Amino acid sequence: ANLNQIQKEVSEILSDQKSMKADIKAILELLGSQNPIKESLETVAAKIVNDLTKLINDCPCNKEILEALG
Amino acid sequence: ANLNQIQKEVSEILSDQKSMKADIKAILELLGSQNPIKESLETVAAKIVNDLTKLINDCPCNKEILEALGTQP
Amino acid sequence: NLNQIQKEVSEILSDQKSMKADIKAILELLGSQNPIKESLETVAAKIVNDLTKLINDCPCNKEILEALGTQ
Amino acid sequence: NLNQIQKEVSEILSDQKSMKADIKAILELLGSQNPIKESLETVAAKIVNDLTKLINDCPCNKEILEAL
Ligand SMILES: [Cl-]
């Protein structure tokens, strides 16, 4: 009765992993499918500053003052 | 040395692995909950640029200058 | 034959041990940081507030008022 | 029964060695990276500093002073 209990639990351990392996794979396929943070942050920061480096050179506030200056 | 000890050992492995399976599941259900960084950035970066666009297009500094020019803003 | 089974089984255990410690480390790392949406909001707010303060503080106006004839 | 068990045990041990190495690597990866809140502070300060460069420069004064 001893050996069978060991046989049962051993079979269960070995089975148990295969769904554990499926999960570890999913975590590695998930980590290696996203972009790095520093590359992502540069690209969006560079977009914020570009969009604003343009509107500030746009000089929206020049009009009304040039209206009064004629 | 003996089958009795092996049995405790085997049971202990089994138990701990069960715990580990659940703990691994959690890691996955928590890297999975974390939604795209590349999508979260774009939405916030739009909100930053929108706000500061509203401010600039308000021309806060014209009031002082139009005052000197004798014209209402 | 129970010697070899005992040696393997101890080595399975000893490894689960180190495995355990790593999952713990992974769960601590992930579990201990602000949601991505939360951390991006405080930074964004930081930026706007840092830039509003400068803009509202009207830096370029004195050069104009000087040229206009004021001071 | 016994040789059966000795084989599943070898199989558990070997299959686990690969799991433990992948787990170590998951950790390796979440280490290679510096905290998200830590990298956002740095990229934020350059965003403001360089628009600070732009605004303090007064790109909109040239057109006003030309009328004065
Ligand atoms: Cl992450």
Side-chain angles (χ1 to χ4, degrees):
Chain A
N2 257 17
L3 210 49
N4 270 58
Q5 188 132 32
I6 305 166
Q7 181 48 63
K8 276 180 223 275
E9 303 207 322
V10 156
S11 256
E12 179 179 20
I13 293 156
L14 193 57
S15 104
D16 261 4
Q17 285 162 173
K18 277 205 67 195
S19 25
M20 192 178 304
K21 283 164 180 290
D23 283 347
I24 298 174
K25 176 168 179 173
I27 307 155
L28 280 161
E29 294 216 36
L30 201 100
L31 287 180
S33 92
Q34 61 205 185
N35 308 347
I37 321 147
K38 190 179 177 179
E39 179 176 340
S40 299
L41 270 158
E42 281 211 63
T43 300
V44 169
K47 157 125 185 178
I48 298 152
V49 295
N50 172 54
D51 277 1
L52 296 173
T53 294
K54 276 180 154 166
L55 176 70
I56 301 175
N57 288 332
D58 198 312
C59 293
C61 304
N62 274 4
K63 195 206 186 172
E64 191 179 2
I65 303 172
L66 298 164
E67 282 178 74
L69 294 184
Chain B
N2 93 119
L3 218 47
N4 285 323
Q5 174 70 113
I6 284 141
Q7 186 153 202
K8 313 288 209 308
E9 295 185 313
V10 165
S11 283
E12 182 181 14
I13 295 161
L14 169 77
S15 153
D16 283 353
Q17 189 164 81
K18 281 202 197 312
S19 293
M20 217 155 284
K21 262 214 312 157
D23 292 332
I24 275 137
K25 277 272 199 295
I27 299 161
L28 168 73
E29 271 257 37
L30 197 42
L31 273 168
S33 278
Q34 235 120 5
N35 53 113
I37 294 150
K38 232 223 180 225
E39 194 270 299
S40 313
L41 282 168
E42 280 184 52
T43 326
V44 169
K47 209 90 209 310
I48 291 161
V49 308
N50 157 70
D51 279 343
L52 304 170
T53 307
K54 213 276 191 215
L55 186 64
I56 300 169
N57 291 340
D58 271 317
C59 293
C61 304
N62 277 19
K63 280 160 88 179
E64 165 155 59
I65 300 158
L66 295 149
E67 274 198 64
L69 293 186
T71 80
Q72 301 277 93
Chain C
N1 223 359
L2 306 178
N3 289 155
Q4 159 215 57
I5 306 184
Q6 176 65 46
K7 178 169 253 167
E8 297 175 323
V9 168
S10 299
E11 187 176 357
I12 295 172
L13 276 168
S14 113
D15 282 9
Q16 279 202 145
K17 208 214 172 196
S18 22
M19 278 172 73
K20 267 161 81 196
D22 292 344
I23 283 153
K24 185 147 192 157
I26 292 149
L27 269 174
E28 146 171 12
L29 175 47
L30 290 174
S32 71
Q33 44 170 7
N34 269 243
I36 327 184
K37 277 224 166 199
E38 213 163 51
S39 264
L40 279 155
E41 259 130 46
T42 59
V43 176
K46 214 168 155 83
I47 293 157
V48 178
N49 164 80
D50 275 28
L51 291 188
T52 305
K53 191 173 180 290
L54 213 87
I55 294 155
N56 278 329
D57 257 314
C58 299
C60 300
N61 270 23
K62 207 173 194 199
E63 199 189 337
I64 300 147
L65 297 177
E66 272 184 307
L68 174 57
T70 28
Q71 306 93 317
Chain D
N1 260 294
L2 201 65
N3 257 74
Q4 183 188 57
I5 292 180
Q6 152 56 208
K7 162 192 169 167
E8 277 145 327
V9 167
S10 292
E11 200 144 354
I12 293 149
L13 171 51
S14 95
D15 287 23
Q16 189 182 73
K17 275 175 182 193
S18 167
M19 285 194 303
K20 86 160 263 217
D22 281 326
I23 283 152
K24 221 95 186 158
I26 285 156
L27 190 62
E28 277 253 17
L29 247 158
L30 310 159
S32 297
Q33 282 164 328
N34 41 329
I36 320 165
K37 201 252 202 173
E38 191 179 22
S39 305
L40 266 159
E41 288 256 63
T42 7
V43 173
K46 188 194 147 59
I47 288 165
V48 319
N49 183 73
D50 290 7
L51 301 167
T52 293
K53 189 85 96 178
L54 184 62
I55 301 155
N56 289 336
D57 264 324
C58 298
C60 300
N61 276 14
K62 163 212 179 83
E63 205 148 26
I64 288 318
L65 304 183
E66 276 178 56
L68 297 165

